[PDB]
């Protein structure tokens, strides 16, 4: 069984050149979802807000498929995210390098699906004026591929509701609304669309 | 005997592929324990508390066994933690990357036992309201595998009492209680359990 797993990873990783990424010929769908744990900083003097969240990313590669009957009925495995291609999904309005709070390990299943869920702390541009009011304030940050268009990486969500079930119970802030919305941008010059997921969080100081 | 150790480490690390991690067929037990040194920061404006502790992890691998009689009676050795697989035990509610305060060196025994005790500084989510009262305040943070279920990594403690024997004598805070306790979570959808160790620290400003 441990022999079988070693063999599986050998066959998948050492045998082949690494996946060079998607193309318009062989595009890829990346599914994105956020789990908000807390709003950990609000800075009105510089208009910066810090979030801590889990970012779930899922995609599927034919080059990561195998037949379980051929590997002692192994149906999935975990591996360092360094061992595989991962997508270049990025926050477009960060003000500091994102900090990774969890191990970077992905789960690969025999149908070629990969799921990767890094915990992260993000600083991003947001004027928090009104957070200390009843109306609260809305912040937004877009996530999308840094170099691939919508003809190469299609971005999708499973739900437009940010998962709040793990939001810190004694947080300084109350979340009034938290959504994640697929948006498509078209430019006059060009036929290819560009895709982002818009993370929109409305919140206020708890009273 | 220096030659023998070189030969042992050669035989253990260079001969075989890396341990690919545990599976449902060949699960693994990780024993976790904390030695709390100080509460080094309490931030009521962001609800962040910082701890400094030693985190002891212990597990056992068949692939790390040897016969001392074949190696000049060597019964154990120390090696860089980078030379071996280590478990992905993670704080689930940190707010910053954990900082490592000590060398990362593991102790390996001929029965395949591994012990690794890194000093760490952790920032995590905690509303410290009540810290300056006689009642004090309770903070909690869960530790668990980021990607393995309880059918693959079983987490346990040797004791539910956090080791306070080295807690800083002139600390700003008094520890009222500190426990490290195995907890289990079940989901109806899925047969495998999920395990965490809950580090719960009740403390107050010293008067």
């Amino acid at each position: 069984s441990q022999a079988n797993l070693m063999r599986l990873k050998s066959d998948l990783f050492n045998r082949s050149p690494m996946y060079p990424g998607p193309t318009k010929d062989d595009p890829l769908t990346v599914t994105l979802g956020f789990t908000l744990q807390d709003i950990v900083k609000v800075d009105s003097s510089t208009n910066e807000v810090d979030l801590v969240y889990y970012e779930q990313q899922r995609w599927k590669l034919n080059s990561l498929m195998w037949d379980p009957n051929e590997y002692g009925n192994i149906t999935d495995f975990r591996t360092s995210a360094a061992d595989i291609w991962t997508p270049d999904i990025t926050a477009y309005s960060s003000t500091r390098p994102v900090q990774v709070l969890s191990p970077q390990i992905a789960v690969v299943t025999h149908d070629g699906s990969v799921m990767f869920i890094p915990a992260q702390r993000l600083s991003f541009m947001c004027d928090p004026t009104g957070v200390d009011s009843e109306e609260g304030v809305t912040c937004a940050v877009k996530f999308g591929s840094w170099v691939y268009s919508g003809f190469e990486i299609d971005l999708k969500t499973d739900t437009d509701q940010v998962d709040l079930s793990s939001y810190y119970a004694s947080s300084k802030y109350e979340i009034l609304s938290a959504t994640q919305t697929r948006q498509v941008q078209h430019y006059s010059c060009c036929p290819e669309p560009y895709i982002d997921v818009n993370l929109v969080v409305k919140f206020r100081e708890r009273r | 005997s220096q030659a023998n150790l070189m030969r042992l480490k050669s035989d253990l690390f260079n001969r075989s592929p890396m341990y690919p991690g545990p599976t449902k067929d060949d699960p693994l037990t990780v024993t976790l324990g904390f030695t709390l040194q100080d509460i080094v920061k309490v931030d009521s404006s962001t609800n962040e508390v910082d701890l400094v502790y030693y985190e002891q992890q212990r597990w056992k691998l068949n692939s790390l066994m040897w016969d001392p009689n074949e190696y000049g009676n060597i019964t154990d050795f120390r090696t860089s933690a980078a030379d071996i697989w280590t478990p992905d035990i993670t704080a689930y509610s940190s707010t910053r990357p954990v900082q490592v305060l000590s060398p990362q060196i593991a102790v390996v025994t001929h029965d395949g036992s591994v012990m690794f005790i890194p000093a760490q500084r952790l920032s995590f989510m905690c509303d410290p309201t009540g810290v300056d009262s006689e009642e004090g305040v309770t903070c909690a943070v869960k530790f668990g595998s980021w990607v393995y279920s309880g059918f693959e990594i079983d987490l346990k403690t040797d004791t539910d009492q956090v080791d306070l024997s080295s807690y800083y004598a002139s600390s700003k805070y008094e520890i009222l209680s500190a426990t490290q306790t195995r907890q289990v979570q079940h989901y109806s959808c899925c047969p495998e359990p999920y395990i965490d160790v809950n580090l719960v620290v009740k403390f107050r400003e010293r008067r």
Partner: peptide, 16 residues
């Protein structure tokens, strides 16, 4: 729920 737990989500991708 399961999908809020990263280890559970990664282990049950057909649900999460």
């Amino acid at each position: 729920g399961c999908c809020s737990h990263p280890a559970c989500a990664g282990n049950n991708q057909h649900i999460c």
